[PDB]
Design a protein around this ligand. Structure first.
Ligand SMILES: CC1(CS(=O)(=O)N2Cc3ccc(Cl)cc3[C@H](C(=O)Nc3cncc4ccccc34)C2)CS(=O)(=O)C1
Ligand SMILES: CC1(CS(=O)(=O)N2Cc3ccc(Cl)cc3[C@H](C(=O)Nc3cncc4ccccc34)C2)CS(=O)(=O)C1
Ligand SMILES: [Cl-]
Lengths: 298, 305
């Protein structure tokens, strides 16, 4: 029993965190094999003009108490790739993956190449993440683990005026319409991840919370007409198919649970909670619910 | 900016998790130097759990009855002893991944990270608090016994909890690493229930100061209160009494934000009376009590917004 916001064990990622310094800027880098990956703004804009003026010895890379020697450098989109002399002996099995909004991941927040905390979060529909970062956190990474392979999906770059965060995949492509520079940019209006709220309602049923269930069902079209009015993402047939296993386990059809979500949206909770929460939670995917309500290990 | 429920990086603890098997029971163990620590109920059958005599069950065992597995390697058990509700298995190999560590016993209201494991393999990490009734609201399934709670201060891992059992309400009970249970609980399947739970007042206050540091002041008022009048009101909402020690501990956050502890106490009294009125505090519609004053200073900036 119990339902917590759970992150993946961070050990395989901790062994990759390094400190990168260029002049007066200090941020975090990801050391995989003989390459250190970090935000290109560490050189700060015309990034190719700023980069051509730098030499290998201008980049100071520190792994623990050891200084790594930079022997080459190149840029790929908004990420800087620093070739080093030493391959990381702690390099795990890994892949670089680009996630979609609504997907969740673990974040290992670092300052000065040292990991300080781990938390779970989701890529919002507006492509921002509601993270917890201070100055020096740039270059901190987001990841998922599938068996023994770490899938790197996010690298932190900046904070927006509303306190939310923006970053790139590990190939340096931004999530969202953002740019790496000091300019007027704001997060778009955000929406609730409908397939995630539904998965979290199934997790509540699994843990013995059934007060919100009703005898009613709905059509997918009628549900979406209601959901659009509460700034909820449209629910697709793919989402319905993905919720199939949880529907079969609890005996509650996906459209049956949608009628419960419609009633919660029009009437509220009435002084009640679901899994210790007075809000409808949208940062657990259907896979996160199945993984936590089973013993999947790494 | 931002305020998340943050756990400590789990790497130093992952390198200590092992699988312990005794007959038909399989659970987790903590391998530190040449000793593996695990719940003593690994020697029990499900029947035994009603009224087990652990001393009588242990005397009948030999070193080779305990199978210890670290990754794909089998560790050899060369000795065994019992210390309260924990079994200590002496092994023939010291853990090369042993971090700098200490065994600490925490008090209710304190927080810690939990590395949940099944079959000696870590599956997830989460943050939680020791409740006033000495239980923890964890996320554990069968096979999680022996999973540990910890804090990492500087490069040292302070082990404070080892998981032993799930009570009938879904809450969890366990021991410190010296095998002493937190709460009036026993490693017996007897009729035992968690005491009435209460809100950790000093933690809710710390969390209100974290919201002021992040720029939110909608809940503040022009009133103050006496400590006694605050406690008479707080008791009525099942909130823990606030002591002078708690007031002293909140001093740094009070000095940083410019809001006296008893003025923050007045704002809490008002929140309990009125509710939130469709508003949230740090993305939450409930008053949060699983962040200590130390957690807030650690996570939040030193500059108020
Ligand atoms: C104070 C702000 C950030 S900044 O001006 O300090 N900043 C400019 C800048 C521009 C482009 C790029 Cl790619 C990166 C950056 C940097 C940046 O965002 N860093 C930070 C990342 N994460 C958390 C941060 C918490 C506090 C301060 C900096 C944080 C530094 C936040 S705001 O109100 O939108 C402006
Ligand atoms: C299913 C229950 C636990 S048990 O009867 O399987 N159990 C008895 C017992 C007694 C004392 C001691 Cl020290 C240990 C144990 C064991 C125990 O609690 N195991 C477990 C630990 N943590 C999470 C668990 C989630 C599900 C199942 C087992 C879990 C085995 C929970 S309940 O509904 O109140 C009965
Ligand atoms: Cl303590």
């Amino acid at each position: 029993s119990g339902f917590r916001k759970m992150a993946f064990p961070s050990g395989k990622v901790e062994g990759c965190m390094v400190q990168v310094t260029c002049g007066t800027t200090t941020l975090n880098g990801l050391w995989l094999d003989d390459v250190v990956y970090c935000p290109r703004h560490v050189i700060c804009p015309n990034y190719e003009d700023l980069l051509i003026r730098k030499s290998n010895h201008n980049f100071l890379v520190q792994a623990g108490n050891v200084q790594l020697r930079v022997i080459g450098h190149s840029m790929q989109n908004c990420v800087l790739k620093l070739k080093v002399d030493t391959a990381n002996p702690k390099t795990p099995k890994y892949k670089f993956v680009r996630i979609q909004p609504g997907q969740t991941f673990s974040v290992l927040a670092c300052y000065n190449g040292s990991p300080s905390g781990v938390y779970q979060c989701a890529m919002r529909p507006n492509f921002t993440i509601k993270g917890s970062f201070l100055n020096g956190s740039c270059g901190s990474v987001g990841f998922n683990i599938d068996y023994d392979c770490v899938s790197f999906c996010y690298m932190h770059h900046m904070e927006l005026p509303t306190g939310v965060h923006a970053g790139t995949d590990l190939e340096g492509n931004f999530y969202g319409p953002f740019v790496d520079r000091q300019t007027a940019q704001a997060a778009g209006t955000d929406t609730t991840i409908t397939v995630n709220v539904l998965a979290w309602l199934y997790a509540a049923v699994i843990n013995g919370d059934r007060w919100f269930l009703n005898r009613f069902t709905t059509t997918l079209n009628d549900f979406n007409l209601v959901a659009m009015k509460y700034n909820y993402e449209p629910l697709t047939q793919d989402h319905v198919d993905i919720l199939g296993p949880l529907s079969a386990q609890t005996g509650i059809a996906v459209l049956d649970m949608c009628a419960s979500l419609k009633e919660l949206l029009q009437n509220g909770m009435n002084g009640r909670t679901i899994l210790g929460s007075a809000l409808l939670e949208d940062e657990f995917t259907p896979f996160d619910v199945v993984r936590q309500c089973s013993g999947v290990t790494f």
